[PDB]
Design a binder for these strands. Structure first.
Lengths: 116, 58, 136, 75, 94
RNA sequence: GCCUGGCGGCCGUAGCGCGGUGGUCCCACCUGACCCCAUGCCGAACUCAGAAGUGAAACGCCGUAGCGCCGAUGGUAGUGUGGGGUCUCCCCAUGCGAGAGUAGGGAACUGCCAGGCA
RNA sequence: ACUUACCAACCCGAUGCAAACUGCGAAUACCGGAGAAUGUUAUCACGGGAGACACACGGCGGGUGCUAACGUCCGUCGUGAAGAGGGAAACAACCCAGACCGCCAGCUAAGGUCCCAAAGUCAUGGUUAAGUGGGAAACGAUGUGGGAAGGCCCAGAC
RNA sequence: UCCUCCUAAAGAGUAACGGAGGAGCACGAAGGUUGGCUAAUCCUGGUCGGACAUCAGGAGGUUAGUGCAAUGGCAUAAGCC
RNA sequence: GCUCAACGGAUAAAAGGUACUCCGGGGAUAACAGGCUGAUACCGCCCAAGAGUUCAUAUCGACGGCGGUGUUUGGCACCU
């Protein structure tokens, strides 16, 4: 199973970040969307979330689900997270390779001020 | 303030160290030593522990 | 003589024989020879008793030996001192408690089961009794 | 042919539940991870679990495999 | 068709049960349905000669306790290991 | 309110199996690959650019107990203390009291956020 | 390729066994925290002086032995050692009990009350006739007291 | 002399010429980290090819593996690249 | 830089005989005898397959079972 293989790739860094107790920026890449949400150190409650399924992001994009869309989402999460006093997170790539548009999303979150 | 009265009725010679400690907890020194104590479940547990060698009266 | 085909360790500790038994109902057959005494049973006593039964109720019937030895008993030879290791495995016993159905029998009348179980209970060291297959 | 055994290694639980510890204190000297490390507990190289912060020892059972964690409550 | 006169056990545990079997009785319980389980003591000899029949384990029994009647069925009997006597009987309501 | 996605609590009353259903959005399969990147061969996987087509598989949801799972009451085993016997084993008073089995329960419950529909 | 009273893997149902098996799991013990009463600080640390490092039996849990030994080796508790007194005839270690001294005073524990020998030849209801009591098993037997049933039976049973 | 299990009485420790086994090393990668992956065995199909060498699919679930004993661990892998 | 492996390592460096023997000790520890035990030994009994022309029990009694004795071979190391 592809989804289950991804989750067991995620698990080590997930449990390590729950062990350190850092607020994590969980990404989620789908073939036509990217999702990004900032989660509290208790793991239960979210703080900030942006994604391409929001029409505030989706209307200003050509196609949700490429590197431009993901850069838009990273910029959005960094902006909202700085508006809510969150400065220093840890990036949870959530089982994907840090390569494509998760790299675009995280680089875009680092340009717009979010410290990781 | 019920003050149950406790009497030692057997010797404490061949006894376990826990039971001699309990008789020292109750304050009993020799056979036929009537000693009055408060009636609380801690004291009652001590009387229960050595009930074969204390006659209690209330 | 009965003996396990292949053990895991050759010498077992003595240990004790306490409490009651597990095999208690006549399970497979219809009549049963149930232990009352404690004791232990060598493989020679089980074989002796089984030959007494098989002779007694001739080659009709069907007999189940519900106990199996599987416990090795070691002895030291004669004129050997104490110490210098554990002895050697001489025979194999089954440990019996009160309640074990030692044997079962089916396919005979009850009066032959009485007869074979009398004939074979005189080859065993434990006090024994006769039971039937009770329904629940 | 026999007659040998190793020296006894003195494993086990050194600090039990609710027992106040200093930082650095060994909680369970053990052999695999029979007990796993929880919050404020570290696992040493020989799977010795030691108190990484001060507090109270908390034995718990977590996760999908029913593992036996050992946390430390800050106290 | 069997009527088994019973009493209610005011005492239980291994002390009280072993005291109850030396007095030629044995404990039992009636559970099942929606009601609470009912601890019951039974005379021994009546139930032993009664269960020598086969119909004891198949037919609906009637247990008379405190002048009532509970139509039960004999669920499961603990027997003594090496003696012809009974330890305990579970009766499911019917 | 209903549905879907993410991250958790919880860790089988939560999992399996059999049957039914879902795609506007979401998700999955999918379409293509010269590029970013990749295969000890292969765009199968990973990755990228997309959205024609289908919900077949997958996944979710709804049923169904064939099984797994939970599980009393009672009794039994054991046992701390004191006493007793016919004493390699048991009994008595007393305190604790299972495992297995039975009746039964049972196809989860829930928090935060986000999107679609009414 | 054709037949077969023989054996039998795996799977399923039922039955047991395990110190070096565990999908379960006590009592107890141990560690930690709080609280009351009691205890001549009984606790810990430091310093002066040791002695001792042959243990024995008895209960409980075991290894070894033959579930042999007044055997041997452990764990734990008691006593002896180093503890007299009363009891078990006599009997370190078993049961009761811990001796500062005195008394021709009382009450008791274990154990006992016919005589040696202190105290019931006590009271009520049973049992055994074997001197059982006051050694010893498998097994044998119309010994004898009790209990629950059952077959036949004054259309006459044994 | 040292390691592992049992004895060992559910904390630790615990004896016997008690029951069973091992060590007196290996490794510059078999260490560090990052990224990824998941076994045994059996069934079916398939050139030489066979009970068993490779391929493909299914069942299965870690019965596998862990440089070397045994025990405890290990999927977030401590296993494999 | 040590199989100092007798692994808390006496030396850098070490095998035997003694019935020609000797001294200090020990019943802490053997040989005899006693004691405890009874595996073994001896004696007895229980079941009865069978042998005995038939017929288990005149006489024997397989496979097994339960005791007694303290007569063997032992075990222990309590007395010396």
């Amino acid at each position: 199973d592809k989804k289950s293989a991804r989750i067991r790739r995620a698990t080590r860094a997930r449990r390590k970040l729950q062990e350190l107790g850092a607020t994590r920026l969980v990404v989620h890449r789908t073939p036509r969307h990217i999702y990004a949400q900032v989660i509290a150190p208790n793991g239960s409650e979210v703080l900030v979330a942006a994604s391409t399924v929001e029409k505030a992001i989706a209307e200003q994009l050509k196609y949700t689900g490429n590197k431009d869309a993901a850069a838009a989402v990273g910029k959005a999460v960094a902006e909202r997270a700085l508006e809510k006093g969150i400065k220093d997170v840890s990036f949870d790539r959530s089982g994907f390779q840090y390569h494509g548009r998760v790299q675009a999303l995280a680089d875009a979150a680092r340009e717009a001020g979010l410290q990781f | 303030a019920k003050t149950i009265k406790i009497t030692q009725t057997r010797s404490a010679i061949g006894r376990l160290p826990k039971h001699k400690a309990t008789l020292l907890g109750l304050g009993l020194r020799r056979i036929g030593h009537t000693v009055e104590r408060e009636d609380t479940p801690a004291i009652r547990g001590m009387i229960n522990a050595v009930s074969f060698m204390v006659k209690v009266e209330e | 003589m009965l003996q396990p085909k292949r053990t895991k360790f050759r010498k077992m500790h003595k240990g004790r024989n306490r409490g009651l038994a597990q095999g208690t109902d006549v399970s497979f057959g219809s009549f049963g020879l149930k232990a009352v005494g404690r004791g232990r049973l060598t493989a020679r006593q089980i074989e002796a008793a089984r030959r007494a039964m098989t002779r007694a109720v001739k080659r009709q019937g069907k007999i189940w030996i519900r106990v199996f030895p599987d416990k090795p008993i070691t002895e030291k030879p004669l004129a050997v001192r104490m110490g210098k290791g554990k002895g050697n495995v001489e025979y194999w016993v089954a440990l019996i408690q009160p309640g074990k159905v030692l044997y079962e029998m089916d396919g005979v009348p009850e009066e032959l089961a009485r007869e074979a179980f009398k004939l074979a209970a005189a080859k065993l060291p434990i006090k024994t009794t006769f039971v039937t297959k009770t329904v629940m | 042919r026999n007659g040998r055994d190793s020296e006894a290694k003195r494993l086990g639980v050194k600090r039990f539940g609710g027992e106040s510890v200093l930082a650095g204190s060994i909680i369970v000297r053990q052999r695999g991870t029979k007990f796993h490390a929880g919050a404020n507990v570290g696992c040493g190289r020989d799977h010795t679990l030691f108190a990484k912060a001060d507090g109270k020892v908390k034995f718990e059972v977590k996760g999908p495999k029913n593992r036996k964690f050992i946390s430390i409550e800050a106290e | 068709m069997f009527t088994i006169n019973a009493e209610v056990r005011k005492e239980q545990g291994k002390g009280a049960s072993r005291r109850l079997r030396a007095a030629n009785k044995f404990p039992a319980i009636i559970y099942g349905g929606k009601e609470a389980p009912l601890a019951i003591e039974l005379d021994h000899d009546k139930v032993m000669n009664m269960q020598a029949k086969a119909e004891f384990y198949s037919e609906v029994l009637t247990i008379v306790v405190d002048g009532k009647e509970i139509k039960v069925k004999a669920q499961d009997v603990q027997r003594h290991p090496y003696k012809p006597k009974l330890q305990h009987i579970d009766f499911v309501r019917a």
